[PDB]
Write an enzyme that holds these catalytic residues in place. Structure first.
Site, PDB file in Angstrom:
ATOM      1  N   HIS A 168      23.534  47.943  49.771  1.00  0.00           N
ATOM      2  CA  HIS A 168      24.024  48.913  48.794  1.00  0.00           C
ATOM      3  C   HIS A 168      23.221  48.908  47.502  1.00  0.00           C
ATOM      4  O   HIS A 168      23.132  49.946  46.837  1.00  0.00           O
ATOM      5  CB  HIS A 168      25.504  48.643  48.446  1.00  0.00           C
ATOM      6  N   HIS A 219      22.660  43.745  38.959  1.00  0.00           N
ATOM      7  CA  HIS A 219      22.160  44.729  39.905  1.00  0.00           C
ATOM      8  C   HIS A 219      22.035  46.057  39.174  1.00  0.00           C
ATOM      9  O   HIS A 219      22.445  46.188  38.018  1.00  0.00           O
ATOM     10  CB  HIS A 219      23.093  44.870  41.106  1.00  0.00           C
ATOM     11  N   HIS A 247      22.163  50.634  39.683  1.00  0.00           N
ATOM     12  CA  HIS A 247      22.421  51.863  40.428  1.00  0.00           C
ATOM     13  C   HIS A 247      21.418  52.910  39.967  1.00  0.00           C
ATOM     14  O   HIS A 247      21.131  53.001  38.768  1.00  0.00           O
ATOM     15  CB  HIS A 247      23.846  52.376  40.193  1.00  0.00           C
ATOM     16  N   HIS A 275      23.964  46.596  35.665  1.00  0.00           N
ATOM     17  CA  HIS A 275      25.262  45.930  35.556  1.00  0.00           C
ATOM     18  C   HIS A 275      25.042  44.424  35.588  1.00  0.00           C
ATOM     19  O   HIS A 275      24.608  43.882  36.613  1.00  0.00           O
ATOM     20  CB  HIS A 275      26.207  46.359  36.685  1.00  0.00           C
ATOM     21  N   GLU A 282      26.109  55.576  36.611  1.00  0.00           N
ATOM     22  CA  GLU A 282      27.511  55.687  37.001  1.00  0.00           C
ATOM     23  C   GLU A 282      28.348  56.178  35.824  1.00  0.00           C
ATOM     24  O   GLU A 282      29.002  57.224  35.906  1.00  0.00           O
ATOM     25  CB  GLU A 282      28.010  54.331  37.511  1.00  0.00           C
ATOM     26  N   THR A 300      32.974  49.380  40.734  1.00  0.00           N
ATOM     27  CA  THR A 300      32.601  50.747  41.106  1.00  0.00           C
ATOM     28  C   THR A 300      32.216  50.887  42.568  1.00  0.00           C
ATOM     29  O   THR A 300      31.803  51.977  42.975  1.00  0.00           O
ATOM     30  CB  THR A 300      31.441  51.265  40.248  1.00  0.00           C
TER      31      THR A 300
HETATM   32  C1  LIG Z   1      35.985  40.677  46.575  1.00  0.00           C
HETATM   33  C2  LIG Z   1      34.818  39.763  46.266  1.00  0.00           C
HETATM   34  C3  LIG Z   1      34.966  38.346  46.675  1.00  0.00           C
HETATM   35  N1  LIG Z   1      33.581  40.357  46.658  1.00  0.00           N
HETATM   36  C4  LIG Z   1      33.319  41.497  45.764  1.00  0.00           C
HETATM   37  C5  LIG Z   1      31.913  41.962  46.006  1.00  0.00           C
HETATM   38  O1  LIG Z   1      31.077  40.932  45.767  1.00  0.00           O
HETATM   39  C6  LIG Z   1      31.659  43.144  45.063  1.00  0.00           C
HETATM   40  O2  LIG Z   1      31.413  42.708  43.818  1.00  0.00           O
HETATM   41  C7  LIG Z   1      31.108  43.679  42.867  1.00  0.00           C
HETATM   42  C8  LIG Z   1      30.714  43.322  41.595  1.00  0.00           C
HETATM   43  C9  LIG Z   1      30.409  44.234  40.625  1.00  0.00           C
HETATM   44  C10 LIG Z   1      30.490  45.547  40.940  1.00  0.00           C
HETATM   45  S1  LIG Z   1      30.101  46.784  39.663  1.00  0.00           S
HETATM   46  N2  LIG Z   1      29.268  47.987  40.432  1.00  0.00           N
HETATM   47  O3  LIG Z   1      31.306  47.303  39.240  1.00  0.00           O
HETATM   48  O4  LIG Z   1      29.513  46.116  38.702  1.00  0.00           O
HETATM   49  C11 LIG Z   1      30.892  45.929  42.175  1.00  0.00           C
HETATM   50  C12 LIG Z   1      31.177  45.016  43.148  1.00  0.00           C
HETATM   51 ZN   LIG Z   2      27.363  48.058  39.614  1.00  0.00          ZN
END
Ligand SMILES: CC(C)NC[C@H](O)COc1ccc(S(N)(=O)=O)cc1
Ligand SMILES: [Zn+2]
Ligand SMILES: CC(C)NC[C@H](O)COc1ccc(S(N)(=O)=O)cc1
Ligand SMILES: CC(C)NC[C@H](O)COc1ccc(S(N)(=O)=O)cc1
Ligand SMILES: CC(C)NC[C@H](O)COc1ccc(S(N)(=O)=O)cc1
Length: 257
Positions: free
Chosen positions: A61, A91, A93, A116, A103, A195
């Site tokens: 992703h 990371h 986007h 992010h 975003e 997100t």
């Molecule tokens: C539920 C856990 C353990 N795993 C979650 C997975 O790693 C996703 O983590 C994330 C972390 C940050 C974001 S963002 N785009 O909001 O910064 C999205 C997903």
């Molecule tokens: Zn993100």
């Protein structure tokens, strides 16, 4: 599984993650004339001098640069936050074209990409516990526009060839994330969510007002990554952004007049 294509993209996510239609979803549009200056907001404290990066991973992703978060080495404090939040990964986007990719939006303006920096609240012990709490994460969001190159980004750009496809990783030690910040730490803040699925409503969002500039060559190399695994038909990793979600019963606060 979920993704960003026509058949598994953001309009489909609610069928397996019903919180997609929840009360504090991210990202949002930041209406600069509606955000309220809050003089009680403290300055942000970004303490990244002891950061220990470990690895960079293509997870299908985006790509994550991962950090050692087993000690208070790289932390975010202050601003709207209570307590200490440890950096676990960053990371991006980004878009297929320079006119889209971020975003969050600012007065409906889309930037070419968004960084992010993801942090979790040390009072919950580990990241998996933190995402189950309304104040478990703090994500520092930084807009990217295309212009001059960002020298502190080039080390990331030059390793992407080695993690082209989903599931590939490479050693990525001694990277200093301070080289990705703009000069000013003026910010907007609001309560929101991850997100991507599972879209958990656990994030204090802190979005910097000042974008960083990256070169066209730098963002072009983001766009050569692949969503797919090795040997599978090639799908360029582009437009991995969720669009703005309804603000509902929330106020965006500004740290600056
Ligand atoms: C539920 C856990 C353990 N795993 C979650 C997975 O790693 C996703 O983590 C994330 C972390 C940050 C974001 S963002 N785009 O909001 O910064 C999205 C997903
Ligand atoms: Zn993100
Ligand atoms: C990869 C093969 C098995 N095809 C995938 C399969 O059709 C699943 O389709 C989907 C489509 C959307 C979603 S959601 N609500 O997570 O975004 C999940 C699975
Ligand atoms: C104990 C130290 C070395 N760090 C361990 C800590 O659990 C970090 O683990 C991580 C760090 C990052 C990620 S990812 N690809 O989601 O960003 C997953 C697990
Ligand atoms: C205490 C620290 C090192 N924890 C943060 C570290 O990155 C671990 O990341 C994770 C990731 C996932 C989980 S799960 N599958 O329980 O939700 C727990 C911790």
């Amino acid at each position: 599984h979920w993704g960003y294509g026509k058949h598994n993209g953001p309009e489909h996510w609610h069928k397996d993650f019903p919180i997609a239609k929840g009360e504090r979803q991210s990202p949002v549009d930041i209406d600069t004339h509606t955000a309220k200056y809050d003089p009680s907001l403290k300055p942000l404290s970004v303490s990244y001098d002891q950061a220990t990066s470990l690895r960079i991973l293509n997870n299908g992703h985006a790509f994550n640069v991962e950090f050692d978060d087993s000690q208070d080495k790289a932390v975010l404090k202050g601003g709207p936050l209570d307590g200490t939040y440890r950096l676990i990964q960053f990371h991006f986007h980004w878009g297929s074209l320079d006119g889209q990719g971020s975003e969050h939006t600012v007065d409906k303006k889309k930037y070419a990409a968004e960084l992010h920096l993801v942090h979790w609240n040390t009072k919950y012990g580990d990241f998996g516990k933190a995402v189950q709490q309304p104040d478990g994460l703090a994500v520092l969001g930084i807009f990217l526009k295309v212009g001059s190159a960002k020298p502190g980004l080039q080390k990331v750009v030059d390793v992407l060839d080695s993690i082209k496809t989903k599931g590939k990783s490479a050693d990525f030690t001694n990277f200093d994330p301070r080289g990705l910040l703009p000069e000013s730490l003026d910010y907007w803040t609001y309560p929101g969510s991850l997100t991507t699925p599972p879209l958990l409503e656990c994030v204090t969002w802190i979005v910097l007002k000042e974008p960083i500039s990256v070169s066209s060559e730098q963002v072009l190399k983001f766009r050569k990554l692949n969503f797919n695994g090795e040997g599978e038909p090639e799908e360029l990793m582009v437009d991995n952004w969720r669009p703005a979600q309804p603000l509902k019963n929330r106020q965006i606060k500004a740290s600056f007049k």
